Amino acid sequence: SIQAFVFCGKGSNLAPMQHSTRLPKALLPIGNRPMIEYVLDWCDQADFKEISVVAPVDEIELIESGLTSFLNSNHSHHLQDPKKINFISTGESLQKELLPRINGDFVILPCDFVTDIPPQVLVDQFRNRDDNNLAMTIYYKNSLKQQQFFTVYSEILLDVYSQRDVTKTKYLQIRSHLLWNYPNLTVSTKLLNSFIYFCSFELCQLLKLGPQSMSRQASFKDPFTGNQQQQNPPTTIFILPNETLFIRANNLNAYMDANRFVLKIKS
Amino acid sequence: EDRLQAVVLTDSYETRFMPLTAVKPRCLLPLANVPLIEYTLEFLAKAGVHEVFLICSSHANQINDYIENSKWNLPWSPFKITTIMSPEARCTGDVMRDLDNRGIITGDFILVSGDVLTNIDFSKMLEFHKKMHLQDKDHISTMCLSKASTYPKTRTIEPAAFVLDKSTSRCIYYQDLPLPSSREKTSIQIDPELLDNVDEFVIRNDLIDCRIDICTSHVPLIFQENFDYQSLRTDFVKGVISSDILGKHIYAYLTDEYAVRVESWQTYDTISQDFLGRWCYPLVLDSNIQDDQTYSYESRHIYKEKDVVLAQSCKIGKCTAIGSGTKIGEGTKIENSVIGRNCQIGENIRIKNSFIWDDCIIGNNSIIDHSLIASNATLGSNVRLNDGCIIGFNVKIDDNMDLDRNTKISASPQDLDDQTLAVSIVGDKGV
Amino acid sequence: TSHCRFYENKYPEIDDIVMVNVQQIAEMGAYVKLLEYDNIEGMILLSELSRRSIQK
Amino acid sequence: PGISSVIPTVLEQSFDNSSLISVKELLLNKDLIHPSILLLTSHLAHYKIVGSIPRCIAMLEVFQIVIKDYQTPKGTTLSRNLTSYLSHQIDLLKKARPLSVTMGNAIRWLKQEISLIDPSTPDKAAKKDLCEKIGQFAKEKIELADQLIIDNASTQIEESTTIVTYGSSKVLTELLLHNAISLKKNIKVIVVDSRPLFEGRKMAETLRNAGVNVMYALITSLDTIFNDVDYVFLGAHSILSNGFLYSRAGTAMLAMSAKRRNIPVLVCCESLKFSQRVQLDSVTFNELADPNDLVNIDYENPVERRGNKGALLNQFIKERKFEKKKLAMENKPKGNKIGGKKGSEGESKDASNEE
């Protein structure tokens, strides 16, 4: 009934450490405490029994070793290596591969995490409010240009539009049918996505038949559209994504943020 | 803060109310027995205006007469009414220009466009405006906003879009779309110049239009400078925003209280319904603002004035109003309708969500379902109407007539169906 | 249209067995349609129905 | 076991018959508890819709699900630890929120069933017939009983009637729906609602969703609408063996008003709702909830507002206690429509011996 999938890959976006043959993306010392330590703590807090970690082509046994030695764990962790990984494909191709192993609801949590927020309340929200998908956004660093945009709702708390500023037209465009149904659409600039994903029971059917997803963002939350034409088969509860805001300083790592995280950790 | 002057824009959205306006004007018309300008006047009084400017053009003489008859020409009031003359059918810019040419304004002035019925205490708002002005020199006008009724699905005529701020509250963009009536457009474009200077953005579409502005002594000068502007909401504010004068800012204000402007028929109906319910707290008929009125609130949402004659064996519904001097016979099954002052009724009228204005004579046997009857128009025998029917001024409806949905009736004794004289669409007669 | 007898004749005999589908109850007993012999109604009084919660 | 003791708000000088607090947020749970029970508990903790009748049905469904998921172990027999598990479940439920008589009855029935089937029959064959039997039972003492109630109402209710109702009893809603759509009658349904619960509101909404003329009523404005009203139905929960209705919120007042002003009160009830336990006042056994529900300004349930209220221990002695279930009188409600067709409230437990 309850399970979690842990995403692992390779450091491509990072500049300075990751290109070494023996050092993996999952096992990295940034600020004394390891990268997958926090994730393990989170999982422990969440009371999930069976957790299966998905591994890339590189590092097959190192991750296992990490899981085993040094660390409290006390849980049956399984590390599996699928074949269809090309990177040029982060985790969607892994997700597509592993679907009969899923019995109930699954939670997606990557290897890279800096976390400080309460973990139970997300899960509880996911459980209660009768929703298929839930994601998290956290404030930008307040300590002394083109960024990213996200949509939020305030009363129920919903997500509608999530597209970035990488590849788009010069003028920002909004759809008419996407605006009339659900009238209030607050667009924030400061918020950053922490890449925490929650999935319900009815998601396994779509991946095996028609793949369209890129970086677990393109065809995952955006194809919720039951407007204009309706030419895609749904699984029945209407398809609706959700979002929740948090105050504490805990975010993602991609660019030169590692050095800031170091500064943060010591307090 | 003492000594204030206000400019009220009356007679602006004619022909939009297509069946009416031929002899009698738009603003002079009553909501529930009492005219729409009266509320505005009351609001002005509450605010504390000392000099009132009113614009009249079409059917202006009657308006003037009404003003004269109202209790404000007499010297007891702090404010006096002066009329501005203008040619038939004009834009809001020309009038502004004329006003500027005349030259009266010293300091802050209130510009109200359209017909607004509102219950918000405004002293606080004024104070806020003052405080904001005291912050920085280059600041112009204040705007009013209110949360929409449930969902904007019945409100198709007003698709007002707003981009706002949390910290300082400033508007950016305005857009309109049809959608369920006609499915055509799917694109809206937003300005990319200023983003990081504001940081916080709240985009909202579910907001009721008010079109009320509290303005400083800059607007007429601005209008003089750039004479390309036609309307204040569509072109002007946006223009100001998009680097017209560098450093100038505008205000946005939010209030949860009831404030809706009249522009279409369905909207008007909704407003009437709201009034019938207990949504308005300072604006209830039982208080009697006009002093000539003698209305009193009764059980089961029924409004009644003093001295009403009604015959035995009748059933009543919900959210109804009955004026004074009404002579009603046996039958009436009244549900969700307003009836004007002094109305003679024969026998048996089945009423479902109807509407009747001042001085109407209804004959014998009529089944009326969701339609409006104007002033001095008489109903004969056998009248049956469908949803969303509007009857104009002085229409003498004779014997045996049947009409379906969206049938409009003329007021002039020109372009629309059903003539004011004898028999409507059963024998074509008249001019 | 669905009608006609199942075996040979419209009317049942003596000691023979019939299956009934009950539509409404509690007035006299059960005067309901048959499935073993035609669609003509057959009645039981409130005594022969019980062998040993009677309404449920 | 979980979490016990350590709770805000004082014990109070007035009204302390029952324990006032329990688990709401899940932390450190036993690795044997079925998730459906947990979910139910989570729901009940902050519920708006259900009341007495649907709750029991839900519980039954949950039990059925559990049975379906259950299989006989190699070591321990079918009747070895099941009873213990049931007891544990009951204890959890009690900890969460006090329970009804119907639930107790259901539990008793389950226990009886457990005893009836001897541990010798094939396991697959056992549960196959068990779940069918349980379904049959459900059909009989609930759905069929509801139907019976409806039919009783039908013969008694005249052409074109005005009905005044309270709460969120499902049976009454069903009846109203029947009146609206299936029989087609002129109905005026006045529904009354209180501060902490929006059950009346919900009922009104449901009625609207069908197409009925509804008047929304309040406790502050009661006498204005009566002085016209012909028939009044109350939201039934349990009838005691004295002749008193243990029911939700300000129904007693309504009953009193009815008694004062001409017309008697009517109550629709199930055949299994009856209790052999006896009490004659509201002080005896009170059902309590947290005073946190009455802190905020009304309008809607979730608001989160800054104003004035929000002190229980901070200010100089402040007690903000309320009751969920009250007692309705004996002589005022006379009408009772049950599984045994006809009877009065004075006839307290004549159906209890008949079963």
XYZ file of C-alpha atoms in Angstrom, chain A residues 52-237:
186
model
C 13.265 1.024 -3.738
C 16.117 3.228 -5.016
C 16.579 3.638 -8.801
C 20.208 3.777 -9.987
C 21.903 5.072 -13.200
C 24.322 3.163 -15.516
C 27.314 4.564 -13.575
C 27.890 3.283 -9.979
C 26.215 -0.121 -9.406
C 27.600 -1.282 -6.021
C 28.914 1.937 -4.439
C 25.379 3.082 -3.603
C 24.662 -0.335 -2.044
C 27.836 -0.060 0.024
C 26.802 3.414 1.188
C 23.386 2.100 2.179
C 24.978 -0.754 4.131
C 28.021 0.684 5.985
C 28.384 3.808 8.219
C 24.609 4.448 8.464
C 21.149 4.216 11.230
C 18.956 2.511 8.610
C 17.134 -0.597 9.990
C 15.050 -0.981 6.786
C 14.959 -3.365 3.806
C 16.383 -1.105 1.075
C 16.643 -2.479 -2.473
C 18.914 -0.941 -5.119
C 17.977 -1.774 -8.728
C 19.657 -0.941 -12.053
C 17.455 -0.667 -15.195
C 19.134 -0.597 -18.639
C 17.287 2.080 -20.678
C 19.146 5.241 -19.556
C 20.643 7.751 -22.031
C 20.673 11.051 -20.010
C 20.135 13.195 -23.158
C 16.113 11.100 -20.024
C 16.616 11.583 -16.265
C 14.077 9.404 -14.408
C 10.959 9.202 -16.569
C 12.458 6.217 -18.450
C 13.109 4.506 -15.091
C 9.550 5.233 -13.950
C 8.177 3.736 -17.167
C 10.242 0.589 -16.583
C 9.218 0.024 -12.928
C 5.403 -0.112 -12.659
C 4.255 -3.698 -11.775
C 6.230 -3.411 -8.490
C 3.901 -0.561 -7.417
C 0.937 -1.879 -5.391
C -0.545 1.374 -4.027
C 0.620 5.000 -3.831
C 4.237 6.027 -4.530
C 6.346 9.052 -3.502
C 9.182 10.405 -5.696
C 12.178 11.842 -3.797
C 15.553 12.514 -5.572
C 18.994 11.809 -4.015
C 19.894 15.518 -3.733
C 18.068 17.150 -0.801
C 18.542 19.979 1.679
C 15.506 19.781 3.998
C 14.298 21.560 7.163
C 10.471 21.516 6.759
C 8.054 19.227 8.718
C 7.601 16.002 6.644
C 4.327 14.520 7.977
C 2.033 17.397 6.980
C 2.720 17.055 3.242
C 1.852 13.351 3.399
C -1.262 14.051 5.463
C -2.387 16.695 2.964
C -1.870 14.243 0.111
C -3.957 11.661 1.964
C -6.874 13.872 3.041
C -7.816 16.481 0.405
C -8.661 13.884 -2.335
C -6.039 14.886 -4.931
C -3.856 12.951 -7.400
C -0.692 15.113 -7.445
C 1.051 17.384 -4.914
C 4.205 19.531 -5.234
C 6.187 21.939 -3.002
C 7.600 25.472 -3.445
C 9.993 27.352 -1.114
C 11.129 31.026 -0.880
C 14.373 32.355 -2.414
C 17.455 33.146 -0.259
C 16.937 36.462 1.573
C 20.495 36.836 2.966
C 22.669 39.648 1.566
C 17.121 39.065 -13.865
C 15.299 36.210 -15.653
C 14.368 33.366 -13.270
C 11.249 31.102 -13.118
C 7.442 31.345 -12.757
C 4.869 29.190 -10.918
C 1.082 29.339 -10.378
C -0.582 29.212 -6.930
C -4.119 29.316 -5.461
C -5.161 30.692 -2.047
C -8.270 30.046 0.085
C -7.849 24.632 -1.538
C -4.311 25.317 -2.931
C -3.891 24.211 -6.583
C -1.260 24.129 -9.362
C -2.028 24.866 -13.042
C 1.003 26.239 -14.959
C 4.659 25.357 -14.270
C 6.659 26.096 -17.479
C 10.107 27.738 -17.207
C 11.886 30.600 -19.045
C 14.354 28.377 -20.985
C 12.445 27.858 -24.280
C 9.381 30.085 -24.873
C 8.074 33.044 -26.943
C 9.089 36.624 -25.968
C 5.559 37.476 -24.759
C 3.976 35.502 -21.892
C 0.783 33.708 -22.990
C -2.275 32.484 -21.035
C -5.140 30.272 -22.318
C -8.828 31.300 -22.166
C -10.397 27.943 -21.154
C -7.673 27.417 -18.523
C -8.628 30.782 -16.939
C -12.475 30.705 -16.947
C -12.617 27.433 -14.991
C -10.823 28.165 -11.688
C -10.846 32.013 -11.961
C -8.123 32.992 -9.443
C -4.542 32.361 -10.620
C -1.732 33.921 -8.549
C 1.668 33.895 -10.308
C 4.796 34.083 -8.116
C 8.421 34.864 -9.060
C 10.333 34.251 -5.788
C 9.261 30.600 -5.278
C 11.581 27.704 -6.184
C 10.464 24.102 -6.783
C 11.968 21.514 -4.399
C 11.071 18.587 -6.748
C 8.993 16.623 -4.199
C 6.323 14.553 -5.982
C 3.357 12.535 -4.686
C 1.471 9.998 -6.829
C -1.847 8.172 -6.353
C -2.983 4.689 -7.520
C -4.169 5.618 -11.046
C -0.985 6.658 -12.909
C 0.446 3.319 -14.150
C -1.889 3.043 -17.185
C -0.697 6.158 -19.081
C 3.084 5.503 -19.032
C 2.985 2.045 -20.686
C 0.778 3.181 -23.605
C 1.982 6.711 -24.482
C 5.281 8.337 -23.386
C 5.613 12.149 -23.673
C 7.274 13.208 -20.381
C 10.642 15.000 -20.234
C 12.615 15.511 -16.969
C 9.471 14.379 -15.019
C 7.793 17.771 -15.685
C 6.524 17.966 -19.302
C 3.797 15.278 -19.259
C 3.220 14.720 -15.529
C 1.140 17.610 -14.112
C 0.406 19.823 -17.159
C -1.758 17.256 -19.061
C -4.563 17.767 -16.489
C -6.487 19.785 -19.119
C -10.159 18.807 -19.378
C -10.878 21.829 -21.581
C -11.474 22.924 -25.227
C -11.398 19.528 -27.005
C -10.789 16.635 -24.530
C -9.004 14.044 -26.715
C -6.928 12.166 -24.097
C -8.358 9.189 -22.100
C -8.568 9.884 -18.314
C -8.527 7.522 -15.300
C -11.334 7.857 -12.728
C -11.833 11.902 -9.595
